[PDB]
Design a protein around this nucleic acid. Structure first.
Lengths: 46, 129, 144, 111
RNA sequence: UUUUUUUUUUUUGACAAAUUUUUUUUUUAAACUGG
RNA sequence: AAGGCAGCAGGCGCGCAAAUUACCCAAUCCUAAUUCAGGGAGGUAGUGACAAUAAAUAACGAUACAGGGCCCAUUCGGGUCUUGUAAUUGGAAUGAGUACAAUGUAAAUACCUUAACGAGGAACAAUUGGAGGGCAAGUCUGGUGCCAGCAGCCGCGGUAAUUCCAG
RNA sequence: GGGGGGAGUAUGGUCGCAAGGCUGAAACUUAAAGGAAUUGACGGAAGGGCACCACCAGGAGUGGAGCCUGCGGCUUAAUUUGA
């Protein structure tokens, strides 16, 4: 061929993904309180 | 041809410290080489040196005592203001607390330390450590 | 030694020799020839608006075997025709002919990127909104 | 452990137990990391938490016969559909993280 | 008496594309009275 | 017959690319015959994620399971040492905002004060990019099957994708 | 001299009834091109050995005929299939 490209199947995978909704979860703390969660969760060894 | 006799003399000394010799013979000799060796002598970097009197220019034999790492020349003889000396001592001296940069002021050939307490400056000749 | 002059009265030679050898530098030449103004498709600009002429499919070079889904665009301020890659999937559906897209550089400062041969540009905005918004269904393309 | 004393014991001292954890941050927990040494140094065969006698039989029906399939059930707990298959009747070594997600996704309180 | 001493060559073109990848684990042998 | 916004505000055009046809001489100063008049100089406000500074999005508590190592052990137990999962509850504090007032100001707006309201997961709910290496963070699951696409670079994808599209 | 190409090409000048020298770009394209050495593999390279799954000297043949036995092909409802 070496003349054209088949533009037919653009988006063929994002169209056929079996979409699923983001499950609702409790929110996470923000700001200084998130560094609390982070930098204890990386250091829980009592 | 020979462009500077100070560079030849300091090359000769530096080559014989490396090989292990205890003496050199340099040729020719000038007042600048005599004064540069006198500054090296008073800081203990070389031993005794003797000047052989030709009728031409003279030769010098210099006794070496180890303890010399490099003597070098700076060519061209850059003009050095009195605030630029610590830009040279930082560049080509191994530490801030030994080693000398020899200058040529109108007060004479001298190392950088007592050019400072004389508060003079001028052109640069070289360095010893 | 060392092949360059060293004498104290020789600053002219060193300065003119540095000048002549600066021309071997890639970006010094383009700064002093104005190659961005005259030769580059964008007029030395980060972005340029265009007009879509056709949808293109370009074969990816080895060792990749995909079809890259780009478009051919004619710029307003210059009239030059460039090929621009249309990013992640479904965006070629969001672009059509005569949508007045906005273009940017493709990352490599005037060079092709990845397995796409001969494309130096990408579309950012189509119909004046975004491609991120249209891809993520955050905004809607105007009816045109 | 969890905020019981780790703030109460920090009264103007600020350093007791401030050392770093093992350090994966996405690989799963170390609930058997103690048992991994014991099976390494003991030079015989040991039985690995043999079976699932009634937590298999009774909880497969309460979970899956209600509405769901294992292909669905393994998708919401994020494991391969043969993992739930060997949690059905028998033939598994039960680890804590998989059995915990099995419990909290379908409610039946048998551990 | 340095003394020893195998002489050789007709013809043989070609073999599509992509690929094969290795990390250093023990934080675990830590438990004792003061009468 | 009349004209010259590279003054202020605004419009068209051009473009990747840039604000209100607002208020006032009260400050800074200027001019005049001059203390008084005039000043789109200048100042005030509107638009303004150009840059820059400071720093909300929570704080104290109470309450529990499930293991694993070792020790002693009857085997039913503790008695430490650690691993994860939350999940139900309580009184306290506050400003983001809505605003009497006063202050601010040429007059206002806003700030700084301050009566009265103003927190329990449904909100008063933080995003932007990433998770093979460079380069910090999954060899978890579903889809696709050198297609779609990713990928600054090396590379990924041809039916068990740590790299695409998703949770 | 300043990554590999484009290219010692284009243009202008110059040396000119010649070939052609000298001077000498850019657009565009590209993730390596390259240097030295290492271990294998290969050589219509060399040297030293070795083998009737190599030859030499020979024997018995097979290939030719009929059959029966596997394979391919064709046929078939199927002529199950691997190599």
């Amino acid at each position: 061929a070496k003349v054209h490209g088949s533009l037919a199947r653009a988006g063929k995978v994002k169209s056929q993904t079996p979409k699923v909704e983001k499950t609702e979860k409790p929110k996470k703390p923000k700001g200084r309180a998130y560094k609390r969660l982070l930098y204890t969760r990386r250091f829980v060894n009592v | 041809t020979r462009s500077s006799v100070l560079a030849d003399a300091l090359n000769a000394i530096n080559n014989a410290e490396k090989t292990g010799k205890r003496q050199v013979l340099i040729r020719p000799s000038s007042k600048v080489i005599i004064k540069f060796l006198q500054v090296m002598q008073k800081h203990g970097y070389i031993g005794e040196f003797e000047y052989i009197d030709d009728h031409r220019s003279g030769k010098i034999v210099v006794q070496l005592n180890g303890r010399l790492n490099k003597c070098g020349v700076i060519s061209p003889r850059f003009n050095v203001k009195i605030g630029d000396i610590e830009k040279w001592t930082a560049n080509l001296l191994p530490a801030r607390q030994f080693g000398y940069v020899i200058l040529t002021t109108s007060a004479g050939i001298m190392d950088h330390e007592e050019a400072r307490r004389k508060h003079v400056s001028g052109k640069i000749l070289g360095f010893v450590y | 030694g060392k092949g360059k002059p060293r004498g104290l009265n020789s600053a002219r030679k060193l300065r003119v020799h540095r000048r002549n050898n600066r021309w071997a530098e890639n970006n010094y030449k383009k700064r002093l020839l104005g190659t961005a103004f005259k030769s580059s498709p964008f007029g030395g600009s980060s972005h340029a608006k265009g007009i879509v002429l056709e949808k293109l499919g370009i074969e990816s070079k080895q060792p990749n075997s995909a079809i890259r889904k780009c478009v051919r665009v004619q710029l307003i301020k210059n009239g030059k025709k460039v090929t621009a890659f249309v990013p992640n999937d479904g965006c070629l559906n969001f672009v059509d002919e005569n949508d007045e897209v906005l273009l940017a550089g493709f990352g490599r400062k005037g060079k092709a990127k990845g397995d796409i041969p001969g494309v130096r540009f990408k579309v950012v905005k189509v119909s004046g909104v975004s491609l991120l918004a249209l891809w993520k269904e955050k905004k809607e393309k105007p009816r045109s | 452990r969890s905020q019981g004393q780790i703030n109460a014991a920090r009264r103007q001292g600020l350093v007791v137990s401030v050392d770093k954890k093992y350090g994966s941050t996405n690989t799963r927990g170390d609930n058997e990391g103690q048992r991994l040494t014991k099976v390494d140094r003991e030079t015989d065969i040991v039985k690995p938490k043999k079976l699932d006698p009634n937590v298999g039989r009774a909880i497969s029906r309460a979970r899956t016969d209600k509405k769901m399939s294992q292909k669905d059930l393994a998708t919401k707990i994020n494991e391969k559909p043969t993992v739930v298959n060997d949690y059905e009747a028998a033939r598994a070594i039960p680890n804590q993280q998989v059995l915990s997600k099995l419990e909290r996704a379908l409610g039946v309180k048998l551990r």
